Amino acid sequence: GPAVGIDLGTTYSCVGVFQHGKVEIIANDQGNRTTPSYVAFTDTERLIGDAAKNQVAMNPTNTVFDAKRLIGRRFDDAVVQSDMKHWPFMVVNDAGRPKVQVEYKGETKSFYPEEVSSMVLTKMKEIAEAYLGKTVTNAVVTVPAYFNDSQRQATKDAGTIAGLNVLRIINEPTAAAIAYGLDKKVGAERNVLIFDLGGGTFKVSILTIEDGIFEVKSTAGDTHLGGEDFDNRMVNHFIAEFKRKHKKDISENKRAVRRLRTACERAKRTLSSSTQASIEIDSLYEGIDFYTSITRARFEELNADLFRGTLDPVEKALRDAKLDKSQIHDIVLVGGSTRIPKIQKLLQDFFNGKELNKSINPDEAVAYGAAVQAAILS
Numbered sequence: 206g207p208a209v210g211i212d213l214g215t216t217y218s219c220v221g222v223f224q225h226g227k228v229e230i231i232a233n234d235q236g237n238r239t240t241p242s243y244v245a246f247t248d249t250e251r252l253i254g255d256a257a258k259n260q261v262a263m264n265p266t267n268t269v270f271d272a273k274r275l276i277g278r279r280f281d282d283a284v285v286q287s288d289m290k291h292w293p294f295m296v297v298n299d300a301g302r303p304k305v306q307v308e309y310k311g312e313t314k315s316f317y318p319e320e321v322s323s324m325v326l327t328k329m330k331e332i333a334e335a336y337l338g339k340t341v342t343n344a345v346v347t348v349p350a351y352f353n354d355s356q357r358q359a360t361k362d363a364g365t366i367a368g369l370n371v372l373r374i375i376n377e378p379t380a381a382a383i384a385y386g387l388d389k390k391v392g393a394e395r396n397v398l399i400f401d402l403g404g405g406t407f408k409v410s411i412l413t414i415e416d417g418i419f420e421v422k423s424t425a426g427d428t429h430l431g432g433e434d435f436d437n438r439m440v441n442h443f444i445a446e447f448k449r450k451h452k453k454d455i456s457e458n459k460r461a462v463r464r465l466r467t468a469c470e471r472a473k474r475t476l477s478s479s480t481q482a483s484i485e486i487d488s489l490y491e492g493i494d495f496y497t498s499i500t501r502a503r504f505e506e507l508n509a510d511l512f513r514g515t516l517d518p519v520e521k522a523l524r525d526a527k528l529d530k531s532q533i534h535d536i537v538l539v540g541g542s543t544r545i546p547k548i549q550k551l552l553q554d555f556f557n558g559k560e561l562n563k564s565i566n567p568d569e570a571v572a573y574g575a576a577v578q579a580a581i582l583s
């Protein structure tokens with residue numbers, strides 16, 4: 206090819222290519238190392254990635270996201286039935302299969318989850334192609350360890366539809382381990398804990414690695430815990446602030462709320478490297494601008510319970526793996542949310558001071574490992 210490694214994420218996707226013994230995590234047209242798993246449909250065009258998420262606040266009904274939550278599932282699926290209630294876009298039943306229904310060029314159209322994901326994969330593929338200046342055909346696509354055969358088949362199908370020859374579908378936690386070279390043979394088995402706190406889901410896997418063979422010792426997590434929940438706590442905090450200073454409640458203005466949410470998500474990232482972040486939105490509500498700031502401490506306070514709750518699934522996993530804290534030789538951070546200093550502290554404290562593998566951007570670790578494995582399979 207070369208073959209590329211693609212992390213098709215719930216909220217953000219990432220692509221990397223292994224060349225000259227090094228992995229290149231490829232930046233998109235906007236210079237972003239990860240790309241939103243969004244697709245939007247309008248009267249005139251279909252948008253994918255950044256372009257799609259950038260207009261989600263004004264086109265909520267025809268901007269699709271969270272396709273990964275539907276992929277490979279039946280319409281009757283209790284989780285599908287639950288999730289549907291929270292999405293602004295429509296999900297219909299087509300012969301027992303869920304399809305998202307949107308308006309595109311004035312006409313009603315429905316897409317299978319793999320079709321939406323194929324669009325996201327197409328974007329990732331083109332991102333790699335612009336960098337490589339060559340056609341990308343072969344790829345390794347990652348999936349959560351919990352995915353069943355249907356979910357995996359559907360993920361592979363999305364790749365096929367995107368024009369990719371999926372060399373192999375591998376687990377995200379295994380990919381993260383590969384990224385750190387933990388798959389290299391050393392004879393004696395090693396116990397690795399993958400702590401993945403992403404944009405929408407939280408997952409922990411305990412793997413036992415002996416001579417490159419990955420033995421999943423245990424798994425645990427929360428399919429509904431991620432960075433978006435942290436943005437939320439900030440949103441409500443600022444809705445209260447605006448209401449105090451301006452005696453106006455923006456809660457019912459869908460667009461104002463989405464704009465504030467974006468501002469919060471951004472401030473949140475800055476808070477991972479700075480102890481303070483500024484928020485300056487123009488024409489937030491009724492021509493009123495919202496210029497404010499938030500401290501790391503405040504952000505931590507607003508999310509204290511959520512942050513700490515991540516430890517329960519960790520204890521659970523260890524217990525199920527019939528392993529003690531001390532038996533974990535490596536702790537790998539995955540997911541953009543593990544970049545939050547407070548999260549790292551909680552996890553380290555829990556592991557009594559143990560160092561965390563975090564040199565590779567957590568939100569890129571999956572793609573990184575996938576890129577390495579793709580090279581190996583090529």
Ligand SMILES: Nc1ncnc2c1ncn2[C@@H]1O[C@H](COP(=O)(O)OP(=O)(O)O)[C@@H](O)[C@H]1O
Nearest residue numbers: 214215216217403404432474477540541542568
């Ligand atoms: N520097 C950072 N600090 C805190 N949160 C971050 C940072 N960078 C990204 N995030 C958050 O990480 C989440 C996305 O994680 P990512 O691993 O890229 O996606 P996914 O979970 O879909 O695989 C989002 O909630 C995003 O806001």
Ligand SMILES: [Cl-]
Nearest residue numbers: 233234235254
């Ligand atoms: Cl792009």
Ligand SMILES: [Cl-]
Nearest residue numbers: 384385386564
């Ligand atoms: Cl390393």
Ligand SMILES: [Mg+2]
Nearest residue numbers: 214215403540
């Ligand atoms: Mg992820």
Ligand code: NA
Nearest residue numbers: 212214217218
């Ligand atoms: Na991702």
